[PDB]
Design a protein that fits this description.
One of its GO terms (biological process) is cytolysis in another organism. It comes from Staphylococcus phage PVL. Belongs to the aerolysin family. This protein is mostly beta strands. The protein has one domain: Distorted Sandwich (Leukocidin-like), CATH 2.70.240. The chain contains one helix and 19 strands. The strands form four sheets. Strands 1, 2, 3, 4, 7, 15 and 16 form a seven-stranded antiparallel sheet that branches. The two termini are 32 Å apart.
């Protein structure tokens, strides 16, 4: 069963939708939890956005050269949610503020009568939903928000390198130790020195709660966007008088923006059925 009783005259109807795109290298695992409460004057839906966004980190030689090689990597991950229904309002979302901690763990609590809150380090609520994601060396913040939308940016922040502390904008970030190699991968730091968000990808965990005016319409559409913004780091071999060789990085910041996989979902407030309307 996917209907749980949260109190007297209150229940949560649970539904899940799963979609993947080889085109974008994204998996969207969406949880739709319908809040059915007699003591609450509105229809409510808790959306838990999970899945996977591949880093799509690629290493390649620069043109017809042997001494310039490149690394294309995700500077920022994009997580967005929007609605086109005038009768639907975005009431809350998690995370709400700029957060730089390695693990982002937050809880949304629900109490009968339409009361929504956030839990610390515990329950006691009638119903609750929890987010958990790792963002090592990255920072999360809300880029854009209103009553119909919320957009997050999980961007490169601070790194501990062999040359000391580096920002996500440092041109020498990720530059390797093998200038005489012919493999573009060797011009860049090994995977054990790369954060998971660069070597593998991102495992999102985001929450958004929407309120629908009762009887205003049976259906509502939601667009969920998962993607990334790519940077290109070029590592040129040098050359010094003494004879020793080293690598030097130059950067094309925001070389490939909004490499996003957008899925349009249809929700039925009466039957609690989910339909995938379309995608890209």
């Amino acid at each position: 069963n996917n209907i749980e009783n949260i109190g007297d005259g209150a229940e949560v109807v649970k539904r899940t939708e799963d979609t993947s795109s080889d085109k974008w290298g994204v998996t969207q695992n969406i949880q739709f939890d319908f809040v059915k409460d007699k003591k609450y004057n509105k229809d409510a839906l808790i959306l838990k956005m999970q899945g996977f966004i591949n880093s799509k980190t690629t290493y390649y030689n620069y043109k017809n050269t042997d001494h310039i090689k490149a690394m294309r990597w995700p500077f920022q991950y994009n997580i967005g949610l929007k609605t086109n229904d005038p009768n639907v309002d975005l009431i809350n979302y998690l995370p709400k503020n700029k957060i730089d901690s390695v693990n982002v763990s937050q809880t949304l609590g629900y109490n009968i009568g339409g009361n929504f809150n956030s839990g610390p380090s515990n329950g006691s609520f009638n119903y609750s939903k929890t987010i958990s994601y790792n963002q090592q060396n990255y920072i999360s913040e809300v880029e854009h928000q209103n009553s119909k939308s919320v957009q997050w940016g999980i961007k490169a922040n601070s790194f501990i390198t062999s040359l000391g502390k580096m920002s996500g904008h440092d041109p020498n970030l990720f530059v390797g130790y093998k200038p005489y190699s012919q493999n573009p991968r060797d011009y860049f730091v090994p995977d054990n020195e790369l954060p998971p968000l660069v070597h593998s990808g991102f495992n999102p965990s985001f929450i958004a709660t929407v309120s629908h005016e009762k009887g205003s319409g049976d259906t509502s559409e939601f667009e969920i966007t998962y993607g990334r913004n790519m940077d290109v780091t070029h590592a040129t071999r040098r050359t010094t008088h003494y004879g020793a060789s080293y690598l030097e990085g130059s950067r094309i910041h925001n070389a490939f923006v909004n490499r996003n996989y957008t899925v349009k979902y249809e929700v039925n407030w009466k039957t609690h059925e989910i339909k995938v309307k379309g995608h890209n």
